[PDB]
Unconditional design. Structure first.
Lengths: 121, 121
């Protein structure tokens, strides 16, 4: 769920996920599709694509078990849609963390830039 | 700081400020600008106008002292910028609560409406 995804993203980035990633670029955030602006944005694109591959579970609302063990996300979750959901989430959290160096707060300003056609998953 | 802001908005409104106010209308939440769509939105605009007037401290980072006395915020903060920043936050919290009457969950969805040109403070 969002809860876990927000948690994981915090856990990896150390950043307030809600302010960093609620709206960012063309792909981070609920409304949002468009050619990735940058690596961060691309993580959210990849993560949205990841969600699309899922069947039988709801990324938004469904809870799943993961742990943080040695400071890394461990999707201990047997149920294999949930495992995949969890793994989508873990992927984006890591991805976002990896891309902190280029994170641009101006890409929060949805009105300060335009979104090209969405990239295809 | 956002810590104190978020607490106050919570205190006043009793709503989760993350779900309610991370993204609302054209002004509430990071990177949002535009003509306020309604009173709640305008609360947020006034609050950024408030921050805009501050010289000498950082509305995001700077912790400050307030108390909740008889379920009203008191900016007991001595230091003059931090107390102003407290008053901004105190004001928005109050404003958001006051305008809960007309709060429109519709305005949470970025792509559901347009933001016209920001008004000037």
């Amino acid at each position: 769920s969002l809860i876990e995804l927000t948690k994981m993203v915090f856990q990896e980035t150390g950043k307030n996920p809600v302010t960093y990633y609620t709206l960012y670029g063309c792909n981070c955030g609920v409304g949002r599709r468009g050619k990735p602006k940058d690596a961060t944005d691309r993580c959210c694109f990849v993560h949205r694509c990841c969600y699309k591959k899922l069947t039988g579970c709801d990324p938004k609302k469904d809870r799943y078990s993961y742990s943080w063990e040695n400071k890394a996300i461990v999707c201990g979750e047997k149920n294999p849609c949930l495992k995949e959901l969890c793994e989508c989430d873990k992927a984006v959290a890591i991805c976002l963390r990896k891309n902190l160096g280029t994170y641009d707060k101006n890409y929060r300003f949805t009105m300060k830039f335009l979104c090209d056609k969405p990239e295809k998953c």
